[PDB]
């Protein structure tokens, strides 16, 4: 009884002063003279429009060239983004939509919401129409977020404090990972996809490994719910985007925190963040309507993506590097160069 | 100087373009109220007369409504209570008959403090439906209502009891401007809330159109 | 199960003016662009017309017009041409092709099983060269289209198909644009070429390869077709 609370107290407090041992200096001491990246001008290129709600998230294409966005009106439009055309609209079953996913084959899509159940549809088929593949169910609670690891697998983050890695043809559970002691409200699928880090309500990040079940690495350090996780491309660091105005490196082969990206004129949530193809940049959607592009080695502001009417909700960066594209609540997507 | 092929995907376009403004046109002429309740309280019976989310689409005097029921979401309410913005309005069941402590009454207007006075729901009305009248008053004769409210000082008749109990729900709101509340018995008549329901919902309404159009 | 089933054939006299009618079931008719290609007693194919998904484009060959008209009708799924004033030419056999255009779509996908009609009494010229060769099995072979104009346009992609014609069946599609490999189709075919140059290559031949192999341009819309090259034994 309270002896393994006080052996769990020995061990965290074995684990705080390891951590601050293997410390010995800062980033941003050890960048000092690197030069900055400079201002960092943004204008916008297309303006892709024909949603009628809020826009919850989004998902680039492999080929970097097709996206899919989801909105509370209903529909799973996905857009060609060099033309602005409109390749297919899935009219959803529930309208209560808050996440989507681009297959990395590109044959299927899939989403989430309010509903509990990960809908999965299938774009190419014979009969020239979309149709839902499979749905998935189970997840007592809203689901947050869904990757697809493999046209045979997926990844789901929901409301339930649990995640789930299920196989699509069985439509089954194959895994479930648990341990956090609220909501995860966002997930990201390492490069390699052997790992994948989640952010909880409960101001926690965690490493699972897909294979097994358990989780290997905790990252604290938060004082609010993280609403955003993004890998780093060299896939040995990652970046939250919690609630109390401020974004934060975290490192996993150290468990320590890196750097925190903070300005005393900020005050409102991050929604999302993602890292830029080389790393450098760093872009995050507010809630005062703009976006801003943090120099991810030595934390200064670099621009300013202002011109939405509304909050930000969904920002992606293409694979090739070449755009990044951002939908807020004004009902608009906008891909900036 | 598009090719051929390209027309043709420009057309296919703007067909599934035209396609979802209708359907958009289609599913703006409707109202949405979003049903909410503490414990039992009276969502079955409410839901009767007229595995997350539950809908309920129902036609009264030529007018499609949607009853968006949370239930069985237990989850942080902070996290997903912004999809709903923009309802029309908000109906709130609970029962005068419980007020037995094991409190429920307590809970019942925490809830409701914790709903009227939110930020997304700073312009959406809130229709109060205090059920179990029969009950109620099979209660009231043989227990006061000082076992609940202490500070109550009044007569054990049912009128004043029932008024009491209103004029405290209806003391929690604190933006009473922009936001009223309606409140009804339902008495389980049969044609006695579905016509108070669409009585507020119509002037919901008209409230909207004259700020729309910029009057009010 | 995908079926387009036509009718309307039959032996008319000179100046008739019989309609020809095409049945779809097992897929969404309601957007798929329906094209009306003939084919001679003996010679190649020829394009006559098409009609887009929502009938809102229209196009006619250069011996039909004025004489044909296209028309379709969702709810009943069917795609009806009407002819009129016929002459001895318009003796050939009518198909019936489906063809869905979007990003990365595959046009000409599925075709009908042709209707014959008998009547008793500019454009960039694609010459296949090579009308006939002897082959053997297990054998690499090459087929070339050289065209008159470069068929590369501004978006950086080459409008090309490839088809094959077997021994009595209808012609199915083979590669589309010069580089996809159609769906069903084994890998051993391929295509390659630029502009004025196309080559298709088969990697190993055996049965059920032998037939009439064609190529077609799709830049405009006087749609051409290639003379028709005859691979047999």
């Known amino acids: 009884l309270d002896q393994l609370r006080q052996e769990a107290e020995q061990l965290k407090n074995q684990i705080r002063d390891a951590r601050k041992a293997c410390a010995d200096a800062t980033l941003s001491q050890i960048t000092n003279n690197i030069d900055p990246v400079g201002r960092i001008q943004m204008r916008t290129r297309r303006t892709l429009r024909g949603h009628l709600a809020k826009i919850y998230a989004m998902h680039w294409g492999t080929d970097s060239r097709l996206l899919v966005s989801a909105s509370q009106d209903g529909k799973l439009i996905i857009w060609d983004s060099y033309t602005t055309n409109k390749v297919h609209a899935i009219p959803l079953r529930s309208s209560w939509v808050m996440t989507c996913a681009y297959a990395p084959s590109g044959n299927y899509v899939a989403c989430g919401g309010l509903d509990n159940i990960c809908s999965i549809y299938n774009l190419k088929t014979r009969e020239g129409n979309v149709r839902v593949s499979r749905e998935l169910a189970g997840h007592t609670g809203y689901l947050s977020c869904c990757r697809f690891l493999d046209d045979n697998q997926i990844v789901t983050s929901s409301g339930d404090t649990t995640c789930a890695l299920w196989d699509i043809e069985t439509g089954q559970q194959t895994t479930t990972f648990t341990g956090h002691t609220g909501d995860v409200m966002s997930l990201s699928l390492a490069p390699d996809t052997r790992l994948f880090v989640s952010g909880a309500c409960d101001a926690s990040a965690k490493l699972w490994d897909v294979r097994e079940g358990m989780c290997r690495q905790t990252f604290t350090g938060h004082e609010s719910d993280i609403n955003a996780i993004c890998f780093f491309p060299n896939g040995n660091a990652f970046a939250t985007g919690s609630d109390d105005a401020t974004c934060r490196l975290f490192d996993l082969r150290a468990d320590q925190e890196l750097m925190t990206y903070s300005h005393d004129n900020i005050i409102c949530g991050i929604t999302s963040v993602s890292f830029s193809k080389s790393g450098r940049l760093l872009l995050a959607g507010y809630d005062d309507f703009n976006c801003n592009v943090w120099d991810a080695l030595k934390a200064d502001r670099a621009g300013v993506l202002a011109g939405h009417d509304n909050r930000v909700s969904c920002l992606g960066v293409t694979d090739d590097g070449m755009a990044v594209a951002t939908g807020s609540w004004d009902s608009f997507l906008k891909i900036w160069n | 100087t598009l090719s051929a092929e390209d027309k043709a995907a420009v057309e296919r376009s703007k067909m599934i373009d035209r396609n979802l403004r209708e359907d958009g046109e289609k599913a703006a002429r409707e109202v949405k109220l979003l049903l909410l309740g503490a414990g039992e309280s009276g969502k079955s019976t409410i839901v009767k007369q007229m595995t997350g989310i539950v809908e309920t689409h129902f036609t009264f005097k030529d007018l499609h409504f949607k009853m968006f029921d949370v239930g069985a979401q237990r989850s942080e309410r902070k996290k997903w209570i912004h999809c709903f913005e923009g309802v029309t309005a908000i109906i709130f069941c609970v029962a005068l008959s419980d007020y037995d402590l094991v409190n429920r009454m307590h809970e019942s207007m925490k809830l409701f403090d914790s709903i009227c006075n939110n930020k997304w729901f700073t312009d959406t009305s809130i229709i109060l439906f205090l059920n179990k009248k029969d009950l109620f008053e099979e209660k009231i004769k043989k227990s006061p209502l000082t076992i609940c409210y202490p500070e109550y000082a009044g007569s054990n008749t049912y009128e004043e009891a029932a008024a009491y109990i209103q004029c405290q729900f209806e003391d929690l709101n604190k933006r009473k401007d922009t936001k009223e509340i309606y409140t009804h018995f339902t008495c389980s008549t049969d044609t006695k809330n579905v016509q108070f329901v669409f009585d507020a919902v119509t002037d919901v309404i008209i409230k909207n159109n004259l700020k729309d159009c910029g009057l009010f | 199960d995908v079926q387009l089933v036509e009718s309307g054939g039959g032996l008319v006299q000179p100046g008739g003016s019989r309609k020809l009618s095409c049945s779809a079931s097992?897929?969404?008719?309601?957007?798929?662009?329906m094209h009306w290609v003939r084919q001679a007693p003996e010679k190649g194919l020829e394009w006559v017309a098409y009609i887009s998904s929502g009938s809102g484009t229209i196009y006619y060959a250069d011996t039909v017009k004025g004489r044909f008209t296209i028309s379709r009708d969702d709810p009943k799924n069917t795609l009806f041409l009407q002819m009129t004033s016929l002459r001895s030419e318009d003796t050939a056999m009518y198909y019936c092709?489906?063809?869905?255009?979007?990003?990365?779509?595959?046009?000409?996908?599925?075709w009908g099983q042709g209707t014959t009609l008998t009547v008793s009494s500019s454009d960039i010229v694609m010459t296949q060269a090579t009308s006939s060769v002897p082959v053997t099995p297990g054998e690499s072979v090459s087929i070339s289209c050289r065209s008159s104009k470069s068929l590369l346009h501004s978006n950086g992609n080459t409008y090309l198909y490839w088809f094959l014609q077997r021994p009595g069946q209808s012609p199915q599609l083979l590669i589309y644009?010069?580089?996809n490999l159609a769906s069903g189709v084994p890998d051993r075919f391929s295509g390659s070429g630029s502009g004025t140059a196309f080559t298709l290559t088969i990697s190993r031949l055996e049965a059920e390869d032998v037939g009439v192999y064609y190529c077609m341009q799709h830049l405009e819309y006087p749609l051409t077709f290639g003379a028709g090259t005859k691979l047999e034994l």
């Open positions: 644009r010069m580089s």
């Open positions: 092709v489906r063809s869905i255009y979007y990003y990365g779509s595959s046009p000409f996908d599925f």
């Open positions: 097992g897929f969404a008719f309601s957007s798929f662009g």
